[PDB]
Amino acid sequence: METAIITLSKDGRITEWNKKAEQLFGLKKENVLGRRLKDLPDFEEIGSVAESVFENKEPVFLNFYKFGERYFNIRFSPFRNAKTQLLEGVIITIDD
Structure with missing residues (x-):
């Protein structure tokens, strides 16, 4: 699969969890x-x-992160709100 997305707020709260994440994680x-x-x-x-990614304000790409029976790519991307310019959380994208 590809494009399981979990988005976190600056407090670590889940603000997005897409259908691929539903399928991948149940x-x-x-x-x-x-x-x-x-x-x-x-x-x-x-x-x-x-x-850690949020605190360092830099994206991180991990490969071969094992979850269950498979290895995944995981990207962590900090983002800002365009209107306030505040760091607002981290988008996590998980791909086979």
Whole structure:
């Protein structure tokens, strides 16, 4: 698969969780939206890397991140709000 997207706010809260993420992880968007990613068993490490990426204001690409039975590419991208210019969170994109 490709393009499982989890977007986190600057407080670590899930603000986006697309249908690919639903299919990959078996959790519905409505069941995770608003929650801290790091509170989800199995996502603690990904949540920690996103925190580090946010603090350093630089994107990070990881390959061969093992999750379940497969290896994945994971990109972490900090972003700003265009209107306020504030750092507003991190987009996480997971691909086979």
